[PDB]
């Protein structure tokens, strides 16, 4: 781990994370929003 990084990740883990994009509902927020702040998981998301 390189503690100077945002997360205690090794030069190798940095690539294992930034080169992996996961698509998951609730981490992907709504477009147009329904209720709650865009922040955190304050804004409800349940895809369609």
């Amino acid at each position: 781990p390189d503690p100077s990084k945002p997360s205690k990740r090794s030069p190798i883990e940095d690539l294992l994370f930034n080169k992996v994009t996961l698509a998951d509902a609730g981490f992907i927020k709504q477009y147009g929003d329904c209720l709650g702040d865009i922040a955190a998981r304050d804004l409800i998301c349940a895809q369609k």
Binding site: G32, D33, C34, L35, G36, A46
Partner: protein, 98 residues
């Protein structure tokens, strides 16, 4: 033959206007698009020919307002799971809900 296309409304019912209620769950019905949802105003890009939307789920995505000049973004009303943290019935029961 009901024209749901962009133009100001000329015909609606005898019932008294109620204006847009933002960030509350309402029953809406604008330009053919009805359902139960939370009204806000347009953040989405639109074409003038596509000022209303229904998505692949057969629910309202966006609609243009009959009285004002704004396009509304409508997102179906909030819901979420009830996850109860509870012990056995061999002990007094507790109820915390996520």
């Amino acid at each position: 033959s009901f024209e749901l296309l962009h133009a100001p409304a000329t015909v609606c019912g005898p019932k008294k206007s109620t204006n847009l209620v933002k960030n509350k769950c309402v029953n809406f019905n604008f330009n053919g698009l009805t359902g139960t949802g939370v009204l806000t105003e347009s953040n989405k890009k639109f074409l003038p020919f596509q000022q209303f939307g229904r998505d692949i789920a057969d629910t309202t995505d966006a609609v243009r307002d009959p009285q004002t000049l704004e396009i509304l973004d409508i997102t179906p009303c909030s819901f979420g799971g009830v996850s109860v943290i509870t012990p056995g019935t061999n002990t007094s029961n507790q109820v915390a809900v996520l």
